[PDB]
């Protein structure tokens, strides 16, 4: 199978900057008879299907702004954006369209640079309605932070709990370029009832000291 490897997996970009993304195939995609490389670039914006952007390595599809340029041949191809715009935030995929099996690279995701922002953390004890299912979820929202790297620990009565935690992260917010995260701690009603203090704490580079939100029953 021709393996397609893209570089980098994700790239932080400032608007107005030139960005180059690479795509390497394990075998040449060049067809000598037809004097073309059969490499296609796709752009997938959030929530929508991928759209063909560039084919035969350097020919743009209709409607693609010409700030996008595809280059290369043989095994190394590059997609360049001369001055990246906010509307260009997407995942870009290259594809071997030369030999079956047709294969895709893993994608390069673009994220916009903004100033660091500390999370607003909110903690929520189990709703009474939930207590009836025999279960108890404690939820911590860590909202509107930047950079994306963040670590969340739950403590019950000062002791760390790793089990029963479910985290989910949003993609970069198109309104303010920030990230958000939800961390849910599920326990049985039984164990919830025998502890008094629930702590959600986060490490993020906006702080030397952990951001902590706690409630005591």
């Amino acid at each position: 199978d021709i393996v397609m490897t893209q570089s980098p997996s994700s790239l932080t970009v400032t608007a107005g900057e030139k960005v180059t993304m690479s795509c390497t195939s394990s075998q040449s995609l060049f067809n000598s008879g037809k004097q073309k490389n059969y490499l296609t670039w796709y752009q997938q914006k959030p929530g929508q299907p991928p759209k063909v952007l560039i084919y035969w390595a350097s020919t743009r599809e209709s409607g693609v702004p010409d700030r996008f340029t595809g280059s290369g041949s043989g095994t190394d191809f590059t997609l360049t954006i001369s001055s990246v715009q906010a509307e260009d935030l997407a995942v870009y995929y290259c594809q071997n369209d030369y030999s079956n099996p047709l294969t895709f690279g893993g994608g390069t995701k673009l994220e916009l640079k903004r100033a660091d922002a500390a999370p607003t953390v909110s903690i929520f004890p189990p709703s009474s309605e939930q207590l009836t299912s025999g279960g108890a979820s404690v939820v911590c929202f860590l909202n509107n932070f930047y950079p994306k790297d963040i670590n969340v620990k739950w403590k019950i009565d000062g002791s760390e709990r790793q089990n029963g935690v479910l985290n989910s992260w949003t993609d970069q917010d198109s309104k303010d370029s920030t990230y958000s995260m939800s961390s849910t701690l599920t326990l049985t009603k039984d164990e919830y009832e025998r502890h008094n203090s629930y702590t959600c704490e986060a490490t993020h580079k906006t702080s030397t000291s952990p951001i902590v939100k706690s409630f005591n029953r």
């Binding site: 047709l102 895709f104 909110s122 939930q130 939820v139 958000s180 849910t184 599920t186």
Partner: protein, 214 residues
């Protein structure tokens, strides 16, 4: 407009079968090769099958060969993917796409996709829980233990969209959990009601959950 529309996605047990279809309009269907491509839960793209414009030649990667069959009905402008021996690994959003002429090929004019969930878990309605806190306040809503995807969640029937975060569902013990937060100014809640509107089509469940103080 050239347009492709996928249909047929559903929850199916492993080892089961499912036939997907793709309705093509706005171009001469028999002049083009067609493909199916799927996007797995971790967002990787995988080519699934290609068929020539006449239907004579079909190609498949080894993962699917022998289990999936692509066929087309050129008089009814319809492409099909018959899937059998389904595996958990085949869960994905499936898309059909046109192979372009003038030797451009590729995969183009992808539809919106149809969702296939291969799983042994049964359809389970969500339990929706209000998250109230004991300039602004953050309220939330926890939608726990549903299957399969999707659920729809809005705040105040869509009137509230700024200050909202809905986190992607994650699968815990073969059931999904999703949550959403909304941040409003303290003058808004609790005088004005904030309601979390959840819909889970597969269990035919609709809940408008008011976030009360007490």
């Amino acid at each position: 407009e050239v347009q492709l529309v996928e249909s047929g996605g559903d929850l199916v047990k492993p080892g089961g079968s499912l036939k997907l279809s793709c309705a093509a309009s706005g171009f001469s269907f028999s002049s083009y090769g067609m493909s199916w491509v799927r996007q797995t839960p971790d967002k990787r793209l995988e080519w699934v099958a290609t068929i020539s414009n006449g239907g004579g030649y079909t190609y498949y990667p080894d993962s699917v060969k022998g289990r999936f069959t692509i066929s087309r009905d050129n008089a009814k402008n319809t492409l099909y993917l018959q899937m059998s021996s389904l595996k958990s690994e085949d869960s994905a959003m499936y898309y059909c796409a046109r192979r372009e002429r003038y030797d451009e090929n590729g995969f183009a004019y992808w539809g919106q996709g149809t969702l296939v969930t291969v799983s042994a878990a049964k359809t389970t309605a969500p339990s929706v829980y209000p998250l109230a806190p004991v300039s602004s306040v953050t309220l939330g809503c926890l939608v726990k233990g549903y299957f399969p995807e999707p659920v729809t969640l809005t705040w105040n029937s869509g009137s509230l969209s700024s200050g909202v975060h809905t986190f992607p569902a994650v699968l815990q013990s073969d059931l999904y959990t999703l949550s959403s937060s909304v941040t409003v100014t303290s003058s808004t809640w609790p005088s004005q009601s904030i309601t979390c509107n959840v819909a889970h089509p597969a269990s035919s469940t609709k809940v408008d959950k008011k976030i009360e103080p007490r």
